[PDB]
Each structure stands twice: as C-alpha cells, then as structure tokens.
C-alpha cells in the first residue's frame, strides 16, 4: 500500500464538464484528449501542448460512446441513445444517420473499413465505410448483445451476449469461427495480444481467457457486486486494470497480485491511462475530472515533464 498516489495546480484549464463526464479518451498521437458530458451534451477537445481546450461542440442527445477514427482529432463517430450515429469532420457536423435498433456498443475494423454495431437486436449491424452502402448482416443467434471488441493482432471479432456466451466471428468471409460458454451478463470484453482475452461480469468477476483453452487462466473477483465497466491492459509492468463505479483495481497479469487501489469521492463513468505514462485520467460524477499521477507505474508524460520535478 506504499504507492503514494497523488491527486491534481491546473494542468489543463477548464478541464470541467458542467455537471458530469460520460466518456474520456485520448488520441493515438497523444496530442488531443476528448471528453463528453451532461448537460447540453458537448464534445470538448484539449490540446496537450497548449494546456487548453481546442473547441467545444454541443450535440442533440447524450453520447454513449465514441471512437476516434483518424489519427488526429479530425474524424469522430458518435453513438447516441436515440439510435443516431453522428459523423464529425474537422469542420464540424458532417452527417447523421439512424440504426434500426438501439446500440449498446460499437467497434471499427481498420482493415476493409467495416464498422460493427452491437445493440438491442440479435443481429449485429455492419456499415462499410469506403462505400456508404450497408453490408450484409450477420446473425449472432443471441437475444441480446452487450459488448464487442476487435483484435488488432490478427483481426478477430467477438461480441458479448446477455446469456453470458462470447461468440467469435471472422471479419473475412463473415462466418462464426467459434463460440465460448461461461445468469450474469458480460459487462466488459477486451482483447490483449494474440492469445489473451478478458471477460467482465455484472456480479463483479474478471476472467482471463486464452483463445485455445476453454478454462480461464486466472479469475479475479471484486468484493463489491457492482459491474466492472472497463478493463485495460498495461504492457510494461503486465498490469491489468479493472474499474468499477466504487473503486479501481490494478493487479498483475500472472498470479493476480494487487498493485494498488484508488477510491475516489464520486463514481467513475470511465477511466483512461495515458500511453507509456503513470498518469491516469478518470471521468466522474463531478464537474471536475480527476487527474492522478503514479510515479511507480511510469514516468510523467512529455507535455507534463515538469511534474517529476514538482514531486
């Protein structure tokens, strides 16, 4: 418990959504950090070099989740609870379209320009992006689908289901390569590497899965019954980050030794880790967004290089 996590004067000015922050994310380059929140749903982009917000864009409805397609801030896709998909170019709003049924989560396959919609239907919608035409559907044969993820290493698509079964599909030829069986539904699904996979459950269990073996390599159980929203992987220290509303748990990939735990004042909607840094970004049920720095986990980010001197 000798980790001495610090909490943050103002690294970025006006890092403050009016009431709450729904989702926090970072770009591939690391130049831009994006956040969305209630009220008057906004998309606010903060430049790391300038330590200020680049722009703020109000939206019609609350955004469940968004994906940064471009390397920079130019191209963003928003999913709405009103079945609305909004595309944003560098200028601003570009186009808006509907999805036949409500969408829980979506993932984009960078090869072939196919974006997959997982929602309140048995079928998982596919939208080709080089040609605007909607592609042929794939039938998952499950009443409700919760989450989806795409493997970067070899392009494998897996969708979570309400029955608790993970079904793996192939983006090429659109056939079901395999299926996995494991009452609680799948809260979070994450791919790490070629061969490692993680399943989150609403009861509060983190199950690490190998693609080749049905049995889980390791299981970690949150004592609270709250579901875990986000599961993240940190390669350098082999630390797996599992986050729920009450607390954030960071533990080792092998043998399940716990690194440290952080409990904030308010519940977390989302958590984010800046690449190759000990800095942690959290979105809370508070106008402020929490910023935490762990010196042990990694060095300070380059744009915040003086933080190491300040400690």
């Amino acid at each position: 418990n000798e980790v001495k996590i610090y909490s943050l004067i103002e690294l970025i000015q006006d890092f403050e959504m009016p009431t709450v922050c729904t989702t926090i994310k970072v770009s591939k380059d690391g130049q831009y950090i994006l956040a969305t929140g209630t009220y008057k749903p906004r998309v606010r982009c903060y430049d790391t070099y300038q330590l200020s917000l680049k722009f703020e864009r109000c939206l019609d409805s609350e955004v469940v989740t968004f994906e940064i397609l471009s390397d920079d801030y130019s191209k963003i896709v928003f999913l709405h609870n009103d079945r609305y998909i909004e595309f944003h170019s560098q200028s601003g709003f570009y186009y808006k379209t509907r999805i036949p049924k409500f969408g829980r989560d979506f993932s984009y396959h960078y090869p072939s320009c196919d974006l997959y919609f997982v929602g309140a239907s048995s079928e998982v919608y596919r939208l080709n992006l080089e040609q605007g035409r909607y592609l042929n559907p794939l039938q998952t044969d499950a009443a409700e689908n919760n989450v989806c993820d795409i493997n970067s290493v070899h392009g494998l698509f897996a969708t979570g289901t309400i029955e608790g079964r993970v079904e793996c599909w192939d983006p090429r030829t659109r056939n079901r390569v395999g299926l996995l069986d494991c009452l609680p539904t799948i809260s979070a699904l994450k791919f790490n590497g070629a061969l490692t996979m993680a399943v989150g459950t609403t009861t509060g269990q983190v199950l690490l899965y190998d693609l080749r073996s049905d049995k889980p390599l390791l299981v970690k159980d949150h004592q609270y019954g709250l579901p875990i929203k986000s599961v993240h992987f940190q390669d350098s220290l082999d630390l797996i980050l599992s986050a729920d509303s009450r607390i954030v748990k960071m533990w080792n990939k092998n043998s399940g030794k716990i690194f440290t735990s952080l409990e904030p004042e308010h519940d977390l909607n989302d958590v984010c880790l800046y690449p190759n840094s000990g800095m942690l970004l959290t979105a809370n049920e508070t106008p402020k967004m929490g910023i935490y720095y762990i010196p042990v986990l990694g060095p300070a980010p380059r744009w915040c290089s003086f933080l190491d001197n300040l400690t």
């Binding site: 000798e2 350098s236 010196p295 042990v296 990694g298 060095p299 290089s305 190491d308 001197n309 400690t311």
Partner: protein
C-alpha cells in the same frame, strides 16, 4: 561473485550495453537475495568523508548544478546495486539512470538517447 564482477566490468567493454539490458542481468528470479544489513555507520565514514557528506545534503537543497556531486555517483551506484542500502523504491527509469551514470560512465545527454526521456526530465529523476 558474478554480480559484483559485472558491475566493475561495465566500464571496460559493457558500456555499449543499453542500460535496460544491463539492468536485466543484475536483477533476476523476480526476488531478492539474502538481505544484507543496512549500510553501517563505519562503512559510511570509510566510503564518504565528512566534507563529502557535507556536499550531498547542500546539493539536495541548492539543487543548482550536478557537476559538484559527479565524483560521488560511481560510489553511490555500487552500494545500491550490491543489495546494500536497503531499498530506495526507485522506478525503472530512475534505476536505469543510476546504472548509466554511476557504472557505465555515460553523460546525461548521451543517456537521453538511450532512456528516450527528455534531458530535463532525467535531471528531475536524478534529483529524486
């Protein structure tokens, strides 16, 4: 015996080794050897003179230039990597920085390319 040999030989032909690679050799089994006692008062007085220890604490406050304490760093680096001095809870970047300066005798600008951190940040890590 090998572990003490490798520290002395870093300055002849093993300086070309990247600090991360040399650090991996020193630390193995994901565990520590039999714990030696913390650095003794008699050993401190032999290694560092009272005027020498006077310099270190004055630099820790003034903080102006690290060239004053450059002669101490080869002496300090040996103690930390011999499993003496207890544990200082140094990070991966901080530990690699100590090995580069104390044992491989690399300058800060040279280490900046190896560590890939900015030279201003490496000074602050060295400050801690």
């Amino acid at each position: 015996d090998f572990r003490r040999r490798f520290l002395a030989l870093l300055s002849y032909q093993f300086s070309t080794f990247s600090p991360s690679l040399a650090l991996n050799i020193i630390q193995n089994r994901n565990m520590g050897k039999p714990a030696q006692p913390a650095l003794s008062r008699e050993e401190l007085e032999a290694l560092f003179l009272p005027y020498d220890l006077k310099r270190l604490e004055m630099y820790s406050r003034n903080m102006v230039d690290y060239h004053l304490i450059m002669d101490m760093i080869p002496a300090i680096s040996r103690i930390y990597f011999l499993n003496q001095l207890g544990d200082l809870a140094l990070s991966a970047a901080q530990s690699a920085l100590l090995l580069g300066i104390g044992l491989q005798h690399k300058s800060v600008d040279q280490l900046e390319k190896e560590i890939e951190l900015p030279s201003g940040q490496l000074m602050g890590l060295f400050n801690r």
